[PDB]
Symmetry: C7
Subunit: 245 residues, 7 copies
């Protein structure tokens, strides 16, 4: 469930609803913790593939450099430690959507293979010469500017244009201030639902405190402040702290 | 299919037509996304070999450092990782055309080997002294200035001459604006036909917006702009953006 | 047992009691030797998991680069050296508390692995695809500015926010001086009980000497001074030394 | 066959004919595309050894660092990868001529080996102790200044003298312009004969265009311009291009 | 046997007597050859562990890496070369004292391991998951300055405080000139007993020569001078030479 | 055999005759192509060991750094590629003379082993433990100043004194012009006899041309010029080429 | 046989005589070609161990950096290439004297191993746990200022003192020019005896040449001149070449 109240955010929402009906690649941009991931999940559920699989892979969080292995999958003995066969992420997303979180940090080599997959609608596992027809909708996410990455030599131009037909950008939280109260309430309800507890309320004062803070860490940071506030138990007074904790 | 409308592109088309009749090596130049690939396909379809195989190998996209192994093919156990025999690209192009896409990414080592293939009209697979006679027409493309690439010592001179007997160059898309509107109509058409959507038209004011943009990314960028316009939806108007998305 | 006497430490204590009640990640900050480890054990014992296991891992003291192996455990064969299967730390801390001591020293590869565990509440050993459900409360300590570490690119930002919902910070000893005497007495006592020696007191002049020193090393340095003083012998007078009375 | 018309070339030719009659080492110099290769072939055919084998090895074109292996041959086992025995090029050249194309690319190690072969008129394969008696006339070419190479420490002086008893140098094409018209016709003829067609002719206007170009690529570049002209089609006219068009 | 005569040394000996009876870690400092080792042996004999083993391991004289191996011990096949099982130094020191000579030279890695042993009073061999309970008194010497080493990033702070509860420091020999005559006689004596010679005396004038020299190499240098004097020969008489001739 | 005509070379020759009679190590010095090699053979043939083997080894010409292995010999196993046993150059020179040509090129390590052999008069092959007794006279040449090379730390001092009891130095060819014409005729005759041709003479103006050149490559370069001359052809006139210039 | 004439050298000789009688470590210093190894043998023969073994090892002349292995000895398979057992130089010195020639070029690791052997009077071979009791008198030479190497960090201070209780230093040949005529004569005799030939005399003329030369390489250089002079056959007469000609 995605909270949208600010008029810039409704604009975003209506853009997203448009692409979500289609099978175009969606590039979801925005600063840290600004909600790129809930947007990607929103588009899947808004899309005609809603009932199909939703597979995510964070290319910025895959240790041991198993990014290529995770993506394409592999056969037993495709490399050191390949002790078994293993389907790629694309295989799991058949008939649904795949989310490439942070394609920016994918290496050039891997970008090449990914491009071919996008061009061919096919994929082979590492160690395999057998092709697999894909019916997969593609979403991607980036924290960097891909254009600048292309200009800087770290990203392929052709891969760029393919992934960026329809880019969606979250404004930073301080640019869409009307989202703050609705978001704050949501995060409170969220957390309290988890713990069987009834949701408390937030003092006007506390709300004001939340409104006049620029939120460098955006909605992630807000969520942090909200959870903190609940520990200083259930309400919302000046139980909000940002930078004097 | 290749659209041509601008009289610059017609002169180019005319040149391609001349050389396509022959068996000469064709080098196809031009900026990124200007149509080097679709040109090379036109030359094949125009040539006496149109019914033969068209094999493309993109040196600028061959991952895992496999350019050599892909080009020449390999026998089983020719290197660590070669679990099977695999014919090279020239073998596949037997009786038709091979396309060496972005040959400037080829290192001096492989350049030497290619030169020998072009000289002897023969190739051997890695791990084999079996000499395979070829009848393969050669096309190539480059995003780089091959001439200066030779002077910088990254490309062999003798190869450069074998490859540049008949160079064809695409103008950047903004140097040939009469191509823009028929290209947009073409891109829209093929996108819609692929998706199975009825194909709409572009409003005149939308056409104007497209003509007064320089297209840094050329036809590729135009394709991108046009697919974006379609999503914004069917019958383009001011659903064109390039720098002001917002 | 944790000695608290200065009003700063009392405010800190009351905050600890607040989070202990909950299952929230607690981050413990403060200079070297200021009590971060004992505060961790305090929170576990104040928590409803106090009857459960307390498991500690000093990420800054795991030699032979076994920090990953120690945390997650490993099947036999997982790496050259792994002669046996071995349970990870999260495993041992099932139903209780794990303490991540000096978590800032954990590299970015490991940090990502950890994030996964916090996000999923599941862990697999090195060399295994077997996911193990965790019911484990997390505490972490750092004597580095984790906010700065994120800015230096040495620390994942998302990991940071997950670990810093409720940061608790020990002031340096020199800015909670009402802690100094009770601590000195505490350290003396526990050292003497341990050694089976009678425990002596401290003379007022020695107390004044302790209060007027800045404790660069904090409570650890105080413990040092006390133990040295006891060697010089029983019933401390100015038998205190720091720099330079030696 | 070799086209000679300029008096500089004719002077070359007379010199070439003088050495051809002998068994002297011959060093063939001059810029790129100026005919060093076709001169070496001429000398061999003018020599008493013309019925004998003619063996070229281009040291600047042997991929994979197989230069040592190619020249001396090898036995199975000799080096990792050598799956079989292989005769060297000197062996093949028995009773005739060998052409060491671009000797300046040989490393000092190989140079020491070449020197011993020249001194002793025998050779061993890599991996073998059997010396094979040689009766082979040596020709060589360089694109680089070898006397300079010696002074820069990159070429052995003793080898330099053995190989340079009689150096022959091609003038650049621009400084023997009487060659250009006959070469161009020879090249048109060459291309046409290879394709069954009759030779076209060159309009006086086209000749003049050819004559007032400096040919930085020498005869190789001229060949290029000739073939391009033939694709542009069969009666040289304004079908000649150099650096403004194609 | 340790000779003490200067009031500074006597102060030092009294402090030594105070720590000897305790189990406290002792750190012994001082310039080179100033008697750090003999103080170690003195503290042991003065301790209630006197009849216990006295084990030394100088980390500044251990050939190869090893050190970790010789300190902790190893099982067979614990690393390339470990051909037999070997007891560690700590193991050997059971019930007595271990002397970690020049601890400054341990790398951070091994420091962490050492730190674990001190905290836990347990050691494992390289290769074993089996920990051995220790009852070992610890001594250390260093040539470097440890606090500066800690500030340099080369020595762990926690290990430092643990090892440095009671640092004992030898003044340079020139700062305690009353030790010189009895040391001179003691060294002669011990040298002559060992060689089975009568022990000579030192003439008053030779004593003056010894007192008015700075002793850059302290007692070691003195031993050197005194052995030299004896070669020059018996009852010493301005048979004393220092650095600067004969 | 050796051509000597100039006053300086006759004196050098006389010095050679004195050592040749002895067993002393001889160091032969001089610029590139000035005849150090032919001087070696001269000393061997003038020595009482003339009937014995003359084994040479050019340390500046042995490919694949198999210098040490070639010197001392090796047993099957000593290193990889040592699929057989092989006698040393010292072993082959038993009863005769060994020539260490371009000895300035041995790495310091090889110098050490070389010193031991000269010290003890014994040699062991690589991978062996048996010392082989030696009766071998030693000759050495260098392009470098070994004195200089010692001060640069590239050449052992003790080895230097052992090899330089009696150094003989060829002056450059331009410093001994009376050698030029006898050499040129000797080089022609040698070349023509080998190829089975009549041997031509050199016209006086060709001699003159040859004398007024500084010969930076010395006798090697002379040999070169003279072989070029015979190709341009018979009875040498000014078919003499030197630099650029560039005739026929 | 040593041959000493200059009064500087007779002082040297008297000091030598004094250490020889003892078992003290002797450090022999002096410029290259001074006679350090001549003196080391003189010390052995003057000592009570004169009937025992005299084992020399040149640390600056051990190829294939086999110095450690040569010193301590080794068992089969102690290190690749060690196809057999081999006693150290200390072992074969048992009951006599070892000479460590050029001990400055021993590395720090080996120095530590050397210190241990001198402290414990024991050695064990490479690849062996068994320690061999030693009764070996130690001599050593150095071309370098060891004190300075200690200051430069290349030589252990503790080893330096153990080895330098009694340094003997040769003056350069030019500082003790009375040695020059007797040494020259001794060397002519030497060389003539090895060849089985009558020894000739040197013209005073020639001797004067010998005394007015600074002998940069000392007695070894003088040797070269004398041998050279004799090739310019037998009767030194200004068959003397140095750096005049
Ligand atoms: N519009 C929204 N409605 C509801 N929850 C939201 C919204 N935006 C953000 N959140 C929540 O706030 C946090 C934002 O994190 P996230 O969706 O991961 O943003 P992000 O841009 O992907 N961060 P990252 O990729 O690490 O730079 C998550 O806990 C979301 O559940
Ligand atoms: N004249 C044309 N007619 C039709 N489609 C065209 C034309 N020119 C370019 N395109 C399309 O534009 C896109 C760009 O790819 P391509 O045309 O082959 O350019 P390119 O020069 O090879 N790009 P690159 O090699 O990556 O620098 C493709 O989708 C082509 O189909
Ligand atoms: N409030 C306290 N009550 C009792 N003991 C304390 C207290 N504070 C510190 N100590 C003791 O003094 C020493 C301080 O150590 P510790 O708790 O490890 O601090 P730390 O912050 O974790 N040091 P570090 O190693 O830099 O991470 C230990 O012996 C503690 O047991
Ligand atoms: N005199 C000539 N007569 C006929 N063809 C010639 C002549 N000179 C050059 N050519 C042709 O020009 C081209 C280049 O000649 P080539 O013998 O390769 O010169 P090159 O100096 O060896 N080139 P390179 O080795 O790369 O520096 C070939 O096609 C030759 O056939
Ligand atoms: N007080 C003392 N009484 C008797 N002998 C002493 C005394 N001090 C030093 N020595 C002797 O002097 C020498 C050097 O002493 P030592 O204990 O080795 O000093 P050190 O400081 O530990 N050397 P180092 O660690 O290398 O700087 C040894 O021979 C000792 O036995
Ligand atoms: N005096 C001479 N008599 C006869 N032939 C000579 C004479 N001097 C030189 N030569 C010949 O001219 C050439 C000179 O070469 P060489 O004798 O090898 O001199 P080198 O000093 O050893 N050259 P290098 O080792 O390269 O510095 C050889 O071909 C010799 O045979
Ligand atoms: N006093 C001497 N009496 C007799 N022979 C001497 C004397 N001094 C030197 N020699 C001889 O002259 C040479 C000097 O060499 P040596 O005795 O090895 O001195 P060295 O200082 O050890 N040279 P090195 O080890 O290479 O630095 C040898 O040939 C000695 O035999
Ligand atoms: Mg993300
Ligand atoms: Mg391309
Ligand atoms: Mg800690
Ligand atoms: Mg060539
Ligand atoms: Mg010590
Ligand atoms: Mg030579
Ligand atoms: Mg020596």
């Amino acid at each position: 469930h995605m909270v949208v109240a600010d008029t810039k955010s409704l604009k975003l929402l209506a853009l997203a609803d448009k692409v979500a009906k289609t099978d175009a690649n969606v590039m979801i941009l925005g600063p840290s913790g600004s909600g790129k991931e809930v947007m990607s999940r929103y588009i899947h559920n808004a899309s005609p593939r809603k009932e199909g699989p939703f597979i995510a892979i964070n290319c910025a969080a895959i240790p041991d450099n198993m990014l290529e292995a995770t993506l394409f999958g592999y056969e037993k003995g495709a490399f050191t430690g390949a002790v078994q066969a293993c389907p790629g992420k694309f295989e799991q997303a058949q008939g649904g959507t795949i989310l490439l979180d942070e394609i920016s940090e994918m290496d050039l080599n891997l970008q090449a293979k990914l491009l071919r997959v996008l061009q061919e609608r096919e994929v082979e596992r590492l160690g395999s010469r057998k092709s697999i027809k894909l019916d997969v909708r593609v979403l991607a996410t980036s924290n960097r500017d891909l254009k600048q990455y292309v200009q800087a030599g770290h990203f392929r131009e052709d891969l760029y244009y393919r992934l960026n037909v329809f880019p969606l950008t979250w404004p930073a939280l301080c640019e869409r201030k009307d989202d703050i109260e609705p978001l704050a309430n949501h995060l409170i309800e969220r957390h309290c639902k988890k713990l069987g507890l009834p949701v408390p309320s937030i003092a006007p004062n506390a709300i004001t405190k939340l409104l006049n803070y620029p939120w460098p860490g955006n909605v992630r940071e807000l969520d942090n402040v909200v959870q903190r506030a609940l520990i200083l138990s259930e309400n919302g007074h000046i139980q909000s702290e940002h930078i004097l904790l």
